[PDB]
Every structure is written in C-alpha cells, then in structure tokens.
C-alpha cells in the first residue's frame, strides 16, 4: 500500500513543483489564518456561551488542526519522501484523520441543529442548549477516535525503494482490510454526510416553504431565496472540495493509472481540494453566521 | 389589531425550569423577541430569534440557561428558561414583528423565582 509516497520518476518539470508547493503553502496559510482568527473572535469577544458559538468553536480548531498537516506534506512532497521520523508519522497522520471527520462531523452537526431549529420547534428547546453542544462534541470525538485511534496504531514509516513512505499496515489479510478502510473513509466522511446535510437542508427549506400569513409575503419569499442560496453554497463546497480526493481514492484502488504529469498534478490538486473545505468552513459557518456576524 | 397571548408563566422554584409561549393566532405578526422587566429595573432584551426559526440571539446574562425557538408552521414563539434564578423574577413581555425595534408588545407575564 502506497500513502504518503507518490511513484514519481521522472523527475517533474520546475512549474509543475513550483505549482505544487505554492498550492499546499496557500492553502495551509489561509487555512490556519482564517480558523486562528474564528477561534480568537470566539475566545475573545463571542465568548462560547452558546450552543452555535461552541460548534463554530469545535468546527475552526479541527479546520486549523486539519491545515497544521500540510507543511510535512509539501516538504514530503519535495523530497519524494517522509524524513520526520516514525513518530511524527503516527501523530501527523492521526491527527490529520481525527481531524477530516471532526471538521466534517461538525459541520453535519450544524446541518442537524439547524433542521431541528426549523422543523422541531418544540424539541429544539432541549436540542440546541450549550450543554447538549459540548456532549455532541464529545459524542462525535468517539466517533471520529474509531478510525483516528486505530491509524495512530498501523501508522508506520516503511522502505519502499530507498525512499520512506508514511504509510498505513494492517492485519491478514492487508486487501481485506486496507480496502475496508477506504471503503469506511468515503461513507462516513463522505456519503452520510452529503445525505445528512442534502436531506437535513432540504427538509428545512420544504418547511419554510410551506408558510403561509395571511399578510405576509414578499419578506417570506425573500428570505426563503436568502436561505435556499446558502443551503445552494454550502452544499456546492462541500461537493466541490471533497468528491475529487474521494474519487480519486477509490479509483486507485480499483485501476492501475499511468503515471504522467497530469496523474501527479491533479492527485495533489485533488488533495489541496480537501483542505479547502477547511479553509472556506470560516467564511460559511462563522464569518456568514448571524450572530457572530456582528463582532467587530 | 394585534393581540399578542403569553402562556407558562408563573411560580417556580429557584434553580427550577418554566417555558413561555407566545401566539398571534391570527397570523397578523411573527412573535420574536422576548423582553422582561425586574421591580425597579428598566426593561431589559431576553432573547429574539429570527423568522426562519434559525438563529436565536440570547442576552449574556441569560446564554447558558435560556434557550428560544420559534414554530414558523403556526406562528409561536417559545423560551424555555432552566435553572431559575431570583435574578430571572420579573413580567416577562413577547413583542412581534409586522409583515410589513418590535410593533407590538404583549401585556406580560409574571414570572416569580421563589422558595
């Protein structure tokens, strides 16, 4: 099993890393800003005493902790090897799955709240408390330690052609179970949560739909295209910075793929894709929420 | 005109949980905001929530105990309040947004924290 170290030879033209690198440093700076300046505006100012503020919370340090891999990946990258060592291994590589699926169990979470907020009114009441907020946290750390635990156990460095890879090793037998993971990686950071947030949003704006006020009206349309718009961008990122590494992935496991320039180029554009999403969930879910919206 | 109706109110313990309610049945305003007003004190906000039902706003004061939510099918407004404190004794005022600050203000509810 090939991770961390891409088959590479020959050696790639000057732009191609040039364009690389650049993709993984920008990313990875505006990633750790933007989510360092949600978690100061939060700490600061909005001070976490609600339940919003402590998913917003939750959402930005999984995001900041998601970009903080980054640099061991672009210096992986240019050496066309891991040179940090078997222990930095695990704990890098641990912490960049804990962190896919806190970032994106969060922001599921925020779908859920919001379809609870909308369609049970009454049962939002004891939903949407601080208190409920932090045990959902905790609940979706469990979650996320049944995969992020485990990698922190098979995460090894190996030789594969004098160079390291930063890889995973499993039991008997490996294409069992190696497959199993991927398998397990695009259902639940991907599939469920496209079908929870599609079908949480989508039963939102059905609701909303269904108001009338025998006054109303054009203030109920307008909001209602306001909403439907944000469910429409929040949705069309999450699909945009996600589907490409999750496809890719799968694809390898299934075909052997030529190696070429455009094999390279994509497979880590299609991974800066992924870490994007952490860089745009402070723009969609702290910076564009309502409440947190009016600090400064 | 309007005619805001504000239920739950009351007699509770201290460190005990009330919930308010608030309707215009008539569809002729959106209940969203929640004011109170302790003996001797001015008018203070409690919490508001938008009309989708989506996002509440909560006075510092109130962030950890209070939650809000709103039934955009049939136009009530709620609030829950837990862990009461005597802080927390005082009439309790829904006030509504017209279609077309608040328009209107219900005539209150009391709420007394005692022993």
């Known amino acids: 099993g090939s991770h961390s170290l891409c088959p590479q030879t020959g050696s790639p033209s000057m732009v191609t890393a040039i364009t690389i690198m650049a993709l993984y440093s920008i990313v990875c700076v505006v990633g750790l800003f933007g989510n360092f300046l949600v978690m100061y505006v939060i700490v600061r100012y909005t001070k976490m005493k609600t339940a919003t503020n402590i998913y917003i919370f939750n959402l930005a340090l999984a995001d900041a902790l998601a970009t903080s891999t980054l640099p061991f990946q672009s210096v992986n990258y240019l050496m066309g090897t891991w040179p940090f060592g078997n222990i930095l291994c695990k704990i890098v590589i641990s912490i960049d799955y804990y962190n896919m699926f806190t970032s994106i169990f969060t922001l599921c979470t925020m779908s859920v709240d919001r379809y609870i907020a909308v369609c049970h009114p009454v049962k939002a009441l004891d939903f949407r408390t601080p208190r409920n907020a932090k045990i959902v946290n905790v609940c979706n750390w469990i979650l996320s330690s049944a995969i992020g635990l485990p990698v922190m156990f098979m995460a090894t460095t190996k030789y594969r052609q004098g160079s390291i890879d930063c890889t995973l090793t499993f039991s008997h037998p490996t294409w069992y179970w190696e497959n199993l993971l991927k398998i397990c990686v695009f259902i639940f950071a991907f599939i469920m949560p496209v079908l929870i947030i599609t079908v949480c949003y989508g039963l939102m704006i059905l609701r909303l739909k269904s108001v009338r006020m025998l006054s109303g009206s054009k203030e109920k349309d307008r909001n209602l295209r306001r909403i439907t718009r944000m469910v429409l961008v929040v949705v069309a990122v999450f699909i945009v910075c996600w589907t490409p590494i999750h496809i890719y992935v799968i694809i390898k496991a299934l075909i052997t793929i030529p190696e070429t320039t455009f094999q390279t180029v994509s497979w880590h554009f299609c991974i800066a894709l992924g870490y994007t999403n952490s860089c745009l969930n402070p723009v969609l879910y702290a910076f564009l929420d309502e409440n947190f919206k009016r600090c400064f | 005109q309007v005619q805001l109706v504000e239920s739950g109110g009351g007699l509770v313990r201290p460190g005990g949980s009330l919930r308010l309610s608030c309707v215009d049945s008539?569809?002729?305003?959106?209940?969203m905001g929640w004011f109170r007003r302790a003996p001797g004190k001015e008018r203070e906000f409690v919490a508001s929530i938008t009309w989708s039902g989506i996002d509440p706003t909560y006075a510092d004061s109130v962030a950890d105990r209070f939650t809000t939510s709103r039934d955009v099918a049939n136009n009530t407004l709620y609030l829950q309040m837990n862990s009461l404190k005597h802080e927390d004794t005082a009439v309790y005022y829904c006030?509504?947004?017209?279609?077309?600050?608040?328009?209107?203000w219900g005539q209150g509810t009391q709420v007394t924290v005692s022993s």
């Open positions: 008539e569809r002729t305003s959106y209940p």
């Open positions: 006030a509504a947004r017209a279609p077309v600050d608040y328009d209107y």
